[model samples]
Target: SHMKTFKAVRFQIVNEHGRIIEYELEDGVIINKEESGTGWLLEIVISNEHYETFKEYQDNEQLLDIRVVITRPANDPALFESTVKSIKNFKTTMSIVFECHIYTLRQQYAESLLEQLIDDGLSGEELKKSFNRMMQSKPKLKDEKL
Candidate 1:
């Protein structure tokens, strides 16, 4: 279903305690689905600034948490509200391109946990159990390589 020609939407995250952050746009900001279509396709670009901040938080071993909100154009309240609601129901942490970025995020977290287990000298059955638990905890996330 991936195609070229879609609209682009961008989001900027302004941390209350610090500078504004941006996320990189892996896919441009265009959405193809219309109301009359099978379903709505919405794409939002995450700024790189936000991504860096997220990485820093991860590196510092800090819990990365943030509220996600959507702002719609004044002209399209219904579309905006519906899209926002749908996005809120999406599983995973909020990010610039949170929906699309979830797979990568989950994979990274899984790998980190795996590394921690290795460091703690968990082996054989114990290691397998730990990995199984981790995988079970995130059943909906895409299985992607970090």
Candidate 2:
């Protein structure tokens, strides 16, 4: 049985003059005859059996911006935008052209942290041991070599 049913849901009819006629559910909605200035752009066909699965999706609310500025010939810079959901400790899940920048994500206090350690407190064998301890304590990425 090749059955095709026409249905519409959660839509509104707008006239060329910007008049609004909103309709609810899938009832009382059909193509108006002989009226064609600007109308339906596309149709989304869903099967009646699996229609319930459509309700499992979320709205586009919790998103953060990802901006990409590229380097190129003549067009030296370009801007593109992307989004990530606002989840805690959420990475982009996958990255292609970039790993994190060489430095910037963290370690803001690194220089200051080192400067204070050398503040004329210890200047003998004590200084050597202190530097070594802090050297190993500096943050390191997995592939980074000491």
Candidate 3:
């Protein structure tokens, strides 16, 4: 008897919580047309601004635990499906984690602005205007296709 084998690739997306939120093997999840590749390669698309934000976060002592990994797969569909499903589950979980992290940071900055207003003893309208200006000062992340 002869044995048959197929290549399977594994990929992962980690979140700021230091958790693996998505993990999948190649054949189980459909790849975008633009991302298909040879036997054992996987391509990931990430935005430029997101990359920069990640870099800045790292540089500023803020830890971003996001990461992706790819690995070769095995020959069984059942196993592959299980792996892909797990990855999909994690993808959703990580999205929430990232959103929560962003929300927390935003709240912290907002609180700091409120504190500054109190310290400066400004009129309510002036404080509101100042805070609005402060909020507008930060650069926003732009979407990019890979």
Candidate 4:
């Protein structure tokens, strides 16, 4: 499978206490490659004003739950269970590197929903009816599983 990169993006992190912190990206990018064990690298350059906060994350070796808006703001965001790999401080900007695996809930839900329809032995027009209806409705997945 081939992976593509994301340019226009927004980033957020779920901290240890589950507090969400938004990070402003400065010419940041998410690199996608399969050979890499981590599968993805988020190279984000943030303002130095956040140096202290990021320093704490780096020092403590925080396991971050990152959410990215690869598409539009209203669309579902991709989630990455990541760890702080490195952070470099420049004069006015700091580059934070993250190594992680990505998962998109929208894709996940669609796959599972299709499986459910197949399991029920729906096919042809019946399958299309159920699939289209559910997809249009955009049913929510149970939190326990996904």
Q: Rate the local accuracy (lDDT) of all candidates.
A: 0.38, 0.29, 0.32, 0.71
Name the lDDT of candidate 1: 0.38
TM-score for each of the candidates? 0.23, 0.19, 0.23, 0.62
lDDT of 3 by residue, 50-141 (tens): 34443444356443222222133442111111011111123222211121111112446566656655676867787777666555332121
lDDT of 2: 0.29
Worst 10 residues of 2 by lDDT: 93-102
Which candidate ranks first by lDDT, i.e. highest?
4
Residue-level lDDT tens digits of model 2 in 33-63: 2234422121223224322222221124211
Candidates sorted on lDDT, descending: 4, 1, 3, 2
Q: Write the per-residue lDDT of candidate 4 for residues 43-127, one digit (tens) a residue.
A: 8888999988778877887666777766456766677877778888999998988887876546576787787778778899988
For candidate 2, report its TM-score. Answer: 0.19
Tell me which residue pairs clash in candidate 2.
none
Candidate 1: lDDT of 110? 70
Error of 4 at 37 (Å): 2.8
Give every collision pair in model 3.
Answer: 8-72, 8-73, 21-90, 23-87
Cα lDDT tens digits, model 1, 2-28, are 563344433333331222343434343
Better of 1 and 2 by TM-score: 1
Candidate with better lDDT, 2 vs 3? 3
